[PDB]
Amino acid sequence: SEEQLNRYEMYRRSAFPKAAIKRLIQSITGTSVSQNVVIAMSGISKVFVGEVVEEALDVCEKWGEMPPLQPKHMREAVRRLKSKGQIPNSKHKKIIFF
């Protein structure tokens, strides 16, 4: 239609800027990264945003609300993703044997 073609345009053309993530990663490493790191790390974070919004619209469709996304559907989105191990936290030393 005429909205699906505009939505497909924003699904492809949108990206995080490489001039800021290269500034963001290098504040964590200390020295330097490469261009093929920033190209991949800018691409995984678009999949991760698409992992949340496609699942936060499943929370909103499950409850009785409309397309505008309140933060109620966004804290619930991170809760359901973390219970399936999708959201990694490297500060919780987990233990499976008890």
Interface with other proteins by CB under 8 A: which residues?
Answer: 5-17, 20-21, 24-25, 28-31, 33-34, 36-37, 39-54, 57, 67-71, 74-75, 78, 86-90
Q: What phi and psi, each to the nearest 5 degrees, are found at residue 85? A: 70, 10
> Measured from the CB of residue 48, what is the shortest distance to other proteins in angstroms?
5
> Measured from the CB of residue 97, what is the shortest distance to other proteins in angstroms?
21
Integer Cα distance of 56 and 97 in angstroms = 32
Interacting residues of 45 by C-beta distance below 8 A, sequence separation 6+: 16, 21
Nearer Cβ to other proteins (85/95): 85
| Inter-residue contact 39 to 19 (CB < 8 Å) | no
Interacting residues of 51 by C-beta distance below 8 A, sequence separation 6+: 81, 86
Nearer Cβ to other proteins (64/88): 88
For residue 32, what are its two tokens?
């330097």
Nearer Cβ to other proteins (4/98): 4
> Measured from the CB of residue 21, what is the shortest distance to other proteins in angstroms?
7
